[PDB]
Amino acid sequence: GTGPDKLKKVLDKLRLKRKDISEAAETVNKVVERLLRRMQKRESEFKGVEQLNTGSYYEHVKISAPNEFDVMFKLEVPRIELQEYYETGAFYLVKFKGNPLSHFLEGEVLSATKMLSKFRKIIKEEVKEIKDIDVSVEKEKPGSPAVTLLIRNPEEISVDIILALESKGSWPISTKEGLPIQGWLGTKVRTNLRREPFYLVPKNAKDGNSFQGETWRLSFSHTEKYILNNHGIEKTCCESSGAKCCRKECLKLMKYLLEQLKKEFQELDAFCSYHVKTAIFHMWTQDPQDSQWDPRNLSSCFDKLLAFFLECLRTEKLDHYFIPKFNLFSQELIDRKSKEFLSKKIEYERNNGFPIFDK
Ligand SMILES: [Zn+2]
Numbered sequence: 001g002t003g004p005d006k007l008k009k010v011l012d013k014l015r016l017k018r019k020d021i022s023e024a025a026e027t028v029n030k031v032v033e034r035l036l037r038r039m040q041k042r043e044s045e046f047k048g049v050e051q052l053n054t055g056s057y058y059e060h061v062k063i064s065a066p067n068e069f070d071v072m073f074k075l076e077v078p079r080i081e082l083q084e085y086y087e088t089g090a091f092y093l094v095k096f097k098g099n100p101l102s103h104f105l106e107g108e109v110l111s112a113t114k115m116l117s118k119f120r121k122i123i124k125e126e127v128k129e130i131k132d133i134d135v136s137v138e139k140e141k142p143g144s145p146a147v148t149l150l151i152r153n154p155e156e157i158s159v160d161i162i163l164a165l166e167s168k169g170s171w172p173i174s175t176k177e178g179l180p181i182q183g184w185l186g187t188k189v190r191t192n193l194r195r196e197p198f199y200l201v202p203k204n205a206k207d208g209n210s211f212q213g214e215t216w217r218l219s220f221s222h223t224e225k226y227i228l229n230n231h232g233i234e235k236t237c238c239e240s241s242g243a244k245c246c247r248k249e250c251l252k253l254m255k256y257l258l259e260q261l262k263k264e265f266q267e268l269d270a271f272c273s274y275h276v277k278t279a280i281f282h283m284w285t286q287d288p289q290d291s292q293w294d295p296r297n298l299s300s301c302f303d304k305l306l307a308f309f310l311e312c313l314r315t316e317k318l319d320h321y322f323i324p325k326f327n328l329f330s331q332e333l334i335d336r337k338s339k340e341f342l343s344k345k346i347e348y349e350r351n352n353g354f355p356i357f358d359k
Pocket of ligand 1: 231237244246
């Protein structure tokens with residue numbers, strides 16, 4: 001019943017939530033594999049699609065909602081020329097240096113709207129041919145670029161399929177000072193990770209417009225997965241012949257704290273798990289030693305993450321780990337009132353034994 005024991009019990013509660021999630025993931029994977037086989041057999045601009053096995057499930061940090069999954073389909077696109085749409089690196093237009101994607105251009109700019117419309121049309125046709133699993137495509141929602149499958153097993157699982165372009169070019173200059181892992185995972189790892197492809201995911205800016213509709217955000221979901229699964233200064237961190245740390249446990253707890261708060265308070269709508277992930281990436285940089293994340297320090301490590309997060313809220317600053325000029329907590333993206341509200345709620349939990357965990 002002490003504070004430390006209670007936090008360990010929350011981790012036990014999250015451990016129990018995993019079984020339903022793992023079972024659901026196996027059903028999701030069967031459907032997704034079936035669909036990818038169909039899309040790989042059919043002749044189209046999307047024939048080369050593959051699953052990118054990233055996101056919270058494959059990082060082992062999906063803590064809730066066994067009825068909701070996101071999956072990314074990557075498509076290699078040669079000779080992408082990027083234009084920064086926001087010079088922070090928050091958004092890009094895609095242009096090209098014939099061209100396999102020529103049907104989806106609006107002038108020299110790749111239309112996410114056109115490309116996604118065709119993606120959706122094909123998915124819808126091919127899903128109707130999957131006869132031995134109960135699966136349909138959800139009606140398109142304006143402003144939602146994912147193509148959502150509805151699987152009945154017999155319970156309903158929603159799967160959001162996100163198209164990601166893959167570029168094998170050098171990472172965008174907005175990322176030059178990003179991935180600050182040099183004192184933690186080191187310079188050789190950083191070099192190696194930056195030699196890997198990067199991804200572009202459709203996302204509407206919702207700004208002045210014109211090319212509202214045709215903007216893309218950068219995605220490093222592969223790099224993030226690698227970091228989560230290779231997160232120690234020692235190569236053996238959390239392996240069978242190494243020592244456990246509490247890095248992922250702290251991420252899980254903080255994600256759960258935010259999830260529980262968000263369920264109760266619609267004033268926290270603008271926050272999301274990626275804020276917590278980004279914060280913990282910075283914490284792992286700040287405190288690189290595995291000994292700083294000893295399992296015995298679960299409570300103190302959790303508390304330092306909350307303190308760091310509260311300082312990000314106070315300063316309205318949380319830099320994208322890969323794109324340092326992109327401030328996820330800018331005044332423009334999140335109102336001061338929302339940040340002050342979340343600060344208050346976090347301090348309350350922290351000072352009163354985290355009652356919200358129990359809801
Ligand atoms: Zn570890």
